Structures are given as C-alpha cells and as structure tokens.
Design a protein around this ligand. Structure first.
Ligand SMILES: [Ca+2]
Ligand SMILES: [Ca+2]
Ligand SMILES: [Ca+2]
Ligand SMILES: [Ca+2]
Ligand SMILES: [Ca+2]
Ligand code: NA
Ligand code: NA
Ligand code: NA
Ligand code: NI
Ligand code: NI
Ligand code: NI
Lengths: 88, 108, 107, 87
C-alpha cells in the first residue's frame, strides 16, 4: 500500500482530471474549466488573483488550455503559498 | 478545505515532520531528507532507496542555493516531479482512444 | 543568430516542412505528424514509432483544442517533453559527484 | 546518428548548461546568469521584457534559481514568439 504522501501525489492527479476530463482533450483544462477548478480547489488568497490572470500565466504555450505540466505550476505555487501561510 | 488543499497540507505536514528534528527547524538536512524518502516515499522511490548515493544526489540537485539544506521551495520540486512521473506511468504506452489510468508509480 | 535561436529555427522549419503539405499550411494533421515523427524523430521516439496507434494517441494528447490538427503552439509541447526526457536520460541513475551527461535518447 | 531536429533538442540542453554550470548548483541558473543567457541567446524582442521580469516569471517555486524545467518555459515562449514573429 502507498504511503499517505504517495497517495496525496496521486490524489493531485485525480483533482486535475476532475476538470480536464470534462470536455475536449483528456489532459487540457480550458479557461472555463480552470475557473471551476480554482473556485472549488484553491483557497481565497489564490482565487483573488483572478481566473483569467491565472490562466494567462499557466497557459505557457498559449494553446488555449492548461495541460498537466502547466497544472503542476499551480500546485507548486499553491504549495509554496500554503507553506508560508502555515507560518503566519 | 478542498481535496487539493488537503493533499498540499499532507506535503507540508510530511515536510515538517522531519525538518523540525535537527538543525534549522524549517529545512531538511541530509539525514532528515533521507528519512522522509525512506519511509514516506518507499514506493515512488523504491529503486532509489536501494542506493544511498542516488538519494544524496537527488538532494544535491534539489539544493539550488547550495547550503546542504532543503527548504520547502526546493523540496516541492521533488513532489511535482514524482507527481509527473506517476501520471506518466499511468499513460505508459497509451493507445486511446479514451482516457484510462494504469497503475501509477510504485505499482499503486 | 545565437545557438538557442538556431535550434528554435530548426524546430520551426521542421514543423512547416510538413504543415504546408496538406490542408491548412500552418497546422499538422495525422499524416503530416506521423511523417515528422517517423524520420525526424526516428531515434527519440524509436520505440513509439513501432506502434502506429501510439503515435496517433501522442497527437491526440497534443491536440489541445481537439480539432484533429496540431498548431505550432501545441506541437512545441512535444519538443519540450523530448528535450526534458533527453536530459533525464543523461542523469539516469546519477550518483555524482559533480555534473555529468550520459548518452541521451536514441543512444 | 541523431537527426537535425533531435540534435536541436539536445543543443537546447547544452545552451542551458552553458549558464547553469557557471557556479552553484549544476542545474540552477541564478538571476545574474539569466541576464547573461538572455543577452546572449535571446533576440531583442525577448530581452525587452527585462531580466528581472523574466526571472520572476520563470522562478516557479521562488527558490532564487531557474532549473531546467523552468528554463523550458522560456524555450516554449521563445519558440512560439519566434513562430509568431516569422512569416
Ligand atoms: Ca497550454
Ligand atoms: Ca532541519
Ligand atoms: Ca537550500
Ligand atoms: Ca489543434
Ligand atoms: Ca526555481
Ligand atoms: Na479537457
Ligand atoms: Na497541414
Ligand atoms: Na548554476
Ligand atoms: Ni515550514
Ligand atoms: Ni491522465
Ligand atoms: Ni544536466
């Protein structure tokens, strides 16, 4: 059985696929999909930046959606922000 | 809180379980980083745990400011890589046409 | 031009070498993508080229907007993946010390 | 023998290591190293954004350095910009 940390990493994969499997490409979170992702998965201090501001920054190749590679940019930034938040 | 927040908290909790032991309580030294990988990453890094020198070079690659300590900012890159490798394992040789996840990293 | 601009120009010229053949002269279809992978990526995707259905699913994953075409914005994610996978192949089982690069993909 | 496209991808790996092997971590490009990378490897319409602005955009985990995966963000954005600027 996987450890709690390893289960947490696979759970992050499940979180992304709850919004990338909605429509279109299986590994693409579109601008409307990211809005539903942010409003449901991210805290208020992350949502306050704006869904459109997040999408323009996450869409690295500017193809119209957020793949799993670009989604890990959000997980990294959310993890660093949540770590500093625990020491406040 | 959401599912993603609880997953991130598990990363922060697991990091703090060992960083507080020796030296600076908010960073991982070589001993603390080895214990985290040996126990909490015994499946995702099962082959790397068999060679201690490989574990040392992973921390050296993660230690970007070269202070022989792993801050949370440097440590979370390892979490993103293992999450990426686990998803790549699920689509190893995927032919479609739909979406399906095979057993991920560490046969889990 | 610099070395990085030289490599990006190679990526752009290789893309347009096949995208201008059929249909829209700025995107790749399944046939134009297969030919690019078959010969220009015969070493990086050697094992993948053995299965035709695998090459199709790669383009399916790359097709972000899901219009059965590959714009350069979508195709360049494959170049970043293979560049990443090649650098990872150079550090496979790296024990150190220092920095070294083993042979990469297709070697 | 690798093809010209595959040699172009391995050349991108070497371009990064011409600046990440200067000092410090072997896979980390610091702020001053990125300014040298941009002034040497990137065109004028990429340098006009600013080295400090590029560094803050590329440093995803904000650890004071740009690793290889963060450098690929610059390669992707330089490639799309070079394709959009061409023709
Ligand atoms: Ca994208
Ligand atoms: Ca410590
Ligand atoms: Ca450090
Ligand atoms: Ca397309
Ligand atoms: Ca960084
Ligand atoms: Na999608
Ligand atoms: Na075409
Ligand atoms: Na360096
Ligand atoms: Ni902490
Ligand atoms: Ni998937
Ligand atoms: Ni290297």
């Amino acid at each position: 059985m996987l450890t709690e940390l390893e289960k947490a990493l696979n759970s992050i994969i499940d979180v992304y696929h709850k919004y990338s499997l909605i429509k279109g490409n299986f590994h693409a979170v579109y601008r409307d999909d990211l809005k539903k992702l942010l409003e449901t998965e991210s805290p208020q201090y992350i949502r306050k930046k704006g869904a459109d501001v997040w999408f323009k920054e996450l869409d690295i190749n500017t193809d119209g959606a957020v793949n799993f590679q670009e989604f890990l940019i959000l997980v990294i930034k959310m993890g660093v922000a949540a770590h500093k938040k625990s020491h406040e | 809180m959401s599912q993603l927040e609880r997953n991130i908290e598990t990363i922060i909790n697991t990091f703090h379980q060992y960083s507080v032991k020796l030296g600076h309580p908010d960073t991982l030294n070589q001993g603390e980083f080895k214990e985290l990988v040996r126990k909490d990453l015994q499946n995702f890094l099962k082959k790397e745990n068999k060679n201690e020198k490989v574990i040392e070079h992973i921390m050296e690659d993660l230690d970007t400011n070269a202070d022989k300590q792993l801050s949370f900012e440097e440590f979370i890159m390892l979490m993103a890589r293992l999450t990426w490798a686990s998803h790549e394992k699920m689509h190893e040789g995927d032919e479609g046409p739909g979406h399906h996840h095979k057993p991920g990293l560490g046969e889990g």
